[PDB]
Amino acid sequence: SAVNDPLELLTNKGTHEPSFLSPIWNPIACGVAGVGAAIFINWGFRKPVFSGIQKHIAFGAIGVGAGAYFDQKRNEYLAKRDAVLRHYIELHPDDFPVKERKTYGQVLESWVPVR
Amino acid sequence: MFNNSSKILFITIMIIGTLITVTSNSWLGAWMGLEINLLSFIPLLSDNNNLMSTEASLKYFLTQVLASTVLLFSSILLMLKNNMNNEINESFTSMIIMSALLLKSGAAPFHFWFPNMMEGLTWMNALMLMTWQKIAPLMLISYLNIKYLLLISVILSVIIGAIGGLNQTSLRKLMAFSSINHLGWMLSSLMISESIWLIYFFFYSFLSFVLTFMFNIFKLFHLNQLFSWFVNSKILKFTLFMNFLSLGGLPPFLGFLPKWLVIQQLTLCNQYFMLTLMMMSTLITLFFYLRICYSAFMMNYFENNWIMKMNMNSINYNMYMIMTFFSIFGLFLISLFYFMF
Amino acid sequence: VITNNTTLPEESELNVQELNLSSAALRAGAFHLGKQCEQANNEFMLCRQELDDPRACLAEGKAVTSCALDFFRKVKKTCHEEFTQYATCLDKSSGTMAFSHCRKTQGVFDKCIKDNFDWDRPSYGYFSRAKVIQSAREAPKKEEKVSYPDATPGLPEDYPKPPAKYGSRFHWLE
Amino acid sequence: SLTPFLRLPLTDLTGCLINHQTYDKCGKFEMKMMECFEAYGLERGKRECADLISDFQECVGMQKQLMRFHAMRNERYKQWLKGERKGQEFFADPPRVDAY
Amino acid sequence: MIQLMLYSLIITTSIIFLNMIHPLALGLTLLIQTIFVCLLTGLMTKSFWYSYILFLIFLGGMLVLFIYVTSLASNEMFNLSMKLTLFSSLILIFMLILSFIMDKTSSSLFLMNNDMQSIINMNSYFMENSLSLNKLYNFPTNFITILLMNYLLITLIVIVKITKLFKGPIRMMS
Amino acid sequence: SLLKRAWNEIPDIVGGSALALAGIVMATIGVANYYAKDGDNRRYKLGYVVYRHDDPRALKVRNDED
Amino acid sequence: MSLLRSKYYDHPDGEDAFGKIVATNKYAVSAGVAWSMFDVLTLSKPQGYLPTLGRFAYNTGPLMGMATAFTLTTLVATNARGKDDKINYLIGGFAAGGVFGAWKHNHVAGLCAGLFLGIAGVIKKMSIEQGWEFFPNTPIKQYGGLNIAGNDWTIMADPPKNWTTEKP
Amino acid sequence: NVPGWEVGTWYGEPVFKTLPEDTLVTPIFKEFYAHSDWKSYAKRAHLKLWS
Amino acid sequence: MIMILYWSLPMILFILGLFCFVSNRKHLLSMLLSLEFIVLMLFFMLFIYLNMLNYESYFSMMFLTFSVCEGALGLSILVSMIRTHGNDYFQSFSIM
Numbered sequence A: 001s002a003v004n005d006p007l008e009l010l011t012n013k014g015t016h017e018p019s020f021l022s023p024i025w026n027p028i029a030c031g032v033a034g035v036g037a038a039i040f041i042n043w044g045f046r047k048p049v050f051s052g053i054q055k056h057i058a059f060g061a062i063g064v065g066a067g068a069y070f071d072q073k074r075n076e077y078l079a080k081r082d083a084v085l086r087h088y089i090e091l092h093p094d095d096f097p098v099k100e101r102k103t104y105g106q107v108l109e110s111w112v113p114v115r
Numbered sequence B: 001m002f003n004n005s006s007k008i009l010f011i012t013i014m015i016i017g018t019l020i021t022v023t024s025n026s027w028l029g030a031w032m033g034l035e036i037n038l039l040s041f042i043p044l045l046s047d048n049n050n051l052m053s054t055e056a057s058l059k060y061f062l063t064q065v066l067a068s069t070v071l072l073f074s075s076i077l078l079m080l081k082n083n084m085n086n087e088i089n090e091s092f093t094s095m096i097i098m099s100a101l102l103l104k105s106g107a108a109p110f111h112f113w114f115p116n117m118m119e120g121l122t123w124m125n126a127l128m129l130m131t132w133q134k135i136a137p138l139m140l141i142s143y144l145n146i147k148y149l150l151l152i153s154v155i156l157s158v159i160i161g162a163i164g165g166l167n168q169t170s171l172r173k174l175m176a177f178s179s180i181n182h183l184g185w186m187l188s189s190l191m192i193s194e195s196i197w198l199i200y201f202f203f204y205s206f207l208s209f210v211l212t213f214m215f216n217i218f219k220l221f222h223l224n225q226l227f228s229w230f231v232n233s234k235i236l237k238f239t240l241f242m243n244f245l246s247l248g249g250l251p252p253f254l255g256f257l258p259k260w261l262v263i264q265q266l267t268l269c270n271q272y273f274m275l276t277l278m279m280m281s282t283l284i285t286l287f288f289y290l291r292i293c294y295s296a297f298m299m300n301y302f303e304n305n306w307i308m309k310m311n312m313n314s315i316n317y318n319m320y321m322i323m324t325f326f327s328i329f330g331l332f333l334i335s336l337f338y339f340m341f
Numbered sequence C: 001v002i003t004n005n006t007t008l009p010e011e012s013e014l015n016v017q018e019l020n021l022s023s024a025a026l027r028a029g030a031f032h033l034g035k036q037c038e039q040a041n042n043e044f045m046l047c048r049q050e051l052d053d054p055r056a057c058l059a060e061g062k063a064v065t066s067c068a069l070d071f072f073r074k075v076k077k078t079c080h081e082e083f084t085q086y087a088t089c090l091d092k093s094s095g096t097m098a099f100s101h102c103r104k105t106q107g108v109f110d111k112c113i114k115d116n117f118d119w120d121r122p123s124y125g126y127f128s129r130a131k132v133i134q135s136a137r138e139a140p141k142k143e144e145k146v147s148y149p150d151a152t153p154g155l156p157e158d159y160p161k162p163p164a165k166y167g168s169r170f171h172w173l174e
Numbered sequence D: 001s002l003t004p005f006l007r008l009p010l011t012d013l014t015g016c017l018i019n020h021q022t023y024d025k026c027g028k029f030e031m032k033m034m035e036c037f038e039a040y041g042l043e044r045g046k047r048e049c050a051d052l053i054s055d056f057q058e059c060v061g062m063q064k065q066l067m068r069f070h071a072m073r074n075e076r077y078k079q080w081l082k083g084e085r086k087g088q089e090f091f092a093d094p095p096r097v098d099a100y
Numbered sequence E: 001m002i003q004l005m006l007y008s009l010i011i012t013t014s015i016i017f018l019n020m021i022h023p024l025a026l027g028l029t030l031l032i033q034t035i036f037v038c039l040l041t042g043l044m045t046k047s048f049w050y051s052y053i054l055f056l057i058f059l060g061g062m063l064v065l066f067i068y069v070t071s072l073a074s075n076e077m078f079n080l081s082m083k084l085t086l087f088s089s090l091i092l093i094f095m096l097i098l099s100f101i102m103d104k105t106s107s108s109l110f111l112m113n114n115d116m117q118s119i120i121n122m123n124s125y126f127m128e129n130s131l132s133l134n135k136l137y138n139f140p141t142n143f144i145t146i147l148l149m150n151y152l153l154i155t156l157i158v159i160v161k162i163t164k165l166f167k168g169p170i171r172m173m174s
Numbered sequence F: 001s002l003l004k005r006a007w008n009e010i011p012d013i014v015g016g017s018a019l020a021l022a023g024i025v026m027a028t029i030g031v032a033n034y035y036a037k038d039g040d041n042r043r044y045k046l047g048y049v050v051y052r053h054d055d056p057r058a059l060k061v062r063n064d065e066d
Numbered sequence G: 001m002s003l004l005r006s007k008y009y010d011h012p013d014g015e016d017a018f019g020k021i022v023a024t025n026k027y028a029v030s031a032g033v034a035w036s037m038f039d040v041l042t043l044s045k046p047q048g049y050l051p052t053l054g055r056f057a058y059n060t061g062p063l064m065g066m067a068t069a070f071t072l073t074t075l076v077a078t079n080a081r082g083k084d085d086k087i088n089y090l091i092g093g094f095a096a097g098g099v100f101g102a103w104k105h106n107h108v109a110g111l112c113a114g115l116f117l118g119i120a121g122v123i124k125k126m127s128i129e130q131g132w133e134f135f136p137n138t139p140i141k142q143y144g145g146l147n148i149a150g151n152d153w154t155i156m157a158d159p160p161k162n163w164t165t166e167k168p
Numbered sequence H: 001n002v003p004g005w006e007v008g009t010w011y012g013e014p015v016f017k018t019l020p021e022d023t024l025v026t027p028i029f030k031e032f033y034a035h036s037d038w039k040s041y042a043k044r045a046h047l048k049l050w051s
Numbered sequence I: 001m002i003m004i005l006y007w008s009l010p011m012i013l014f015i016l017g018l019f020c021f022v023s024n025r026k027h028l029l030s031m032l033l034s035l036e037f038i039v040l041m042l043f044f045m046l047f048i049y050l051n052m053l054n055y056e057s058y059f060s061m062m063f064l065t066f067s068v069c070e071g072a073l074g075l076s077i078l079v080s081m082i083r084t085h086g087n088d089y090f091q092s093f094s095i096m
């Protein structure tokens, strides 16, 4: 690519594979947060930590469901954000033009020497 | 709220009046919503078995009635000169509207009613005063594009609300001065991003709403009542007192996140000097937070001998410990949030 | 405001004879006047509503005043004294000149009108209804919707929404 | 006009409180300004509707008309004080009461 | 001339109201102030309705406030001062002289009366308080009236809650 | 049971409640009678209104007898 | 439209004198009158017509001394050497600190205030020569998040609009 | 005698824009009586208030 | 000038009413009467605004209703002073 086109910069070609934790990190972290919250409730009421597992199971299920739902809402929010940015770039092509890529063989920066 | 269903009715008309205020496309509808909110909040905060609660209600009444009449006066002047609901270029009547809104919000130098009245309250009405009653004047400040008056209010609020909270050993006036200091961070975010203000307000109300529950349940109206407060395990008191380091903005707690998003949005919008002025302010706020934190961080105290068991409500202490977990380990939910994009 | 660019009719156009009758003389014989001047009054008031400009419908105002003057000449030629008695009764009978205060002289005046011109009095609510007419002048065009070719555009619903490149791209998150 | 922040069903009653649409001579001008306030927005309407805002402003506020009238009244009294205008012919001929 | 006289009287009574320590002096001063304000408000509108409404409101309010005068601060000393009387008299005669030597066309209000409206206004020929008070009971703003009924009921509930009738009567040193 | 106590102790309230219920019934009857016919299009109109023949409000004009 | 309506940086530094004196004393007047207005009513009430004006002069006049001494010291240091720089503002801050020490009869306040106002002066000189602004107009002003058009929750139905995006 | 004055405009600035060039807007009550004494203004405007 | 010849007066009277509201008076009921005076002058200014517009004077009763409920709130606060104190002296109330 000899030019840095913003349309080519913003368009998701599909070469970025998502990570292993990318679909699963938010539900397991929210489930761990719910289990720890129920543990913290049982600790403050001077119960055993794993006494009431109904609260543990309910808090974990609430955490996993909320994590999956808000991860989906996050994904559509980011998709709409990049769609807004792409549509604003195609709406005003004069303010975001195609710039020629300029190598270091045409650039004279000032090097900083220590002595 | 407590002991009557008519207080639940007053809360309902409170929510109705505030949501009438903030949704108004005219200043007159916002003004009548403030009248409804004032009508709702006079009877809560009034108790005939307390001699100082009626004086606090009188101070709130006089301050809000003076501020609502100046707000209607400058609104009528704005309609008289620039006949639409807003103003094309900023003038002095917009500054009078902003000043009458700043008297409602409690920001400096119009802050003087706020901790002088909070000595007369309970803790739940304090939480309603410094969280929900700051919805309606702060959301109406967003319609005004004034930089110098808002900047003076921000600087004065973060200077005074940090300095002023050092002298009081009473927790209500100290927490009122903390709410003045956190008001300056809200007003600094009000002229860069309304969403970032909403996030700082939501997390500030969350930390206020979890710090009220520790003081409402155990009736901690003084600083040495924290030192005499009995817990059945000193590690539990050590964990429960980490919310003050959260409200001080210390990472990795939850309250570092709204301050951090305000600092990130301020630096993107090329404000650096008042941000640095608010860095020196929040050190003093963290300093008078640490005098509360003396009551749990030394792990052993010369405590009073007669009290042996601590008592709490069921549902209130159950709801308290959900949010104390999220006020400590709340930065693990940084991936879940999608407002900040 | 009125500037030099806006045209105005000259003083020679507005110097015509006008109706200088009093209120009691206009209220007497008011029902017989509109049965003869239904066409001029309706055209003038219709073009005064939509046109909304005093320079327009000036000739319609001339036609209205000419019809009123012609009706008052026709009343003046035949039994002027009965109209004088009816106008005097309507002036002197009440504060607000209501027709219900004296009806005998109204009956005598209507009898003279029916004997002379064979005109009957209309009902009490003939002129208070909606009146439909056919107008000689063409109707004014309805305003076209205002056009804004450079509006404030939003994201359309049929725009494609691929997943975001590198996720949020905000502080190590994806 | 202003905007509703965090708008709810509770703004539907409030939104029709004070406006010029009810039998006023100015409201059509106001309507036109509201048209670009629906098209350009509240922020682009402060810059791209400077003609439509000012017509409504001096139509209902009557600023320029009243400044014109007070310049017409002050010049006549200034000519009377300077001596150019005679005291007998100080005022012009009055209009008919059936006019206007 | 009457409007400038009401201006001068309102200015003089406002100077008197700013200087009175005793609550009954404030009550009588705001009595004559609301009389003059009611007449002045009437001058601006085509009809005289809201002046009457404001007078019933401000005579229903201070009727209660005198009972609170006789229950709290019943015993307080009046202090007449010659400086205030001389100041009010000099300012009043000065503003009557200044209003007499002023052109009253420039100092008149630009708000349109019932006769300042033109003849072509067909809405002016209706009943005088119909179209002004219509929008209280019309479709877009009946819900604000609904909100006012519920607001007055909530106001009454608040008054009953924070004035406990079973605690006894109110006086000084109760 | 409670109607006899209210009719013994506060009979003017019971008579007023009967009058108000009769008024509510007559208001319902009046609204239904007003909207059963073309009540919005009144026979006599305030002001001086003129309609053209091609106007959609022209054919709604009543032609009743006074 | 007078000499009172002048700014500090309307001219290059060292070129003008009286406009700089009037401007810096105008900020001194504003700060002193504001602080004395929140002083004489709130703490240490004078309870007199003349001691109120005495406290006004006490809170105003030394700020005029600060402003005049700093501006005159910066003017002398600019007119002495050819180059304009930061240590002219530093020694002007030390002169204002000496004025503070003459006010409070404490040399230590005079030095510490001289060091603080010299640091303020060199930071302000860095601002005026580097081009950045202390309180700039805000470039990015979010009036909401995403979908600010899409979250209209109103129960009334919209009548058809009178404007179109279509060209005639 | 006034140099900047033009007929019908406020010192050259037009009162009403976005209008056709030959339109007529109705002037205010004060401009209609701008060349008359108080007796005409009180003759017309003070009809209801006197009787 | 136009702001001076029209509606400059009730701004001055509202400022005088605000200074009467905040002046050092012995009793609360004088402040309630000063509240009634600033209701009167706000009514004057709102009435000028609602009478520039033709048929929008219906709002002028709503402001009266919210102001009367403000006065009723102040009167009930004055009753609630007697439930705790024996007086309405502003010096007798707690300064903190």
Ligand SMILES: CCCCCCCCCCCCCC
Pocket: A023, A024, A027, A028, A031, A032, A035, A060, A064, A068
């Ligand atoms: C205590 C363990 C909590 C997590 C359990 C496993 C959750 C896995 C992620 C949620 C489902 C994702 C489906 C795509």
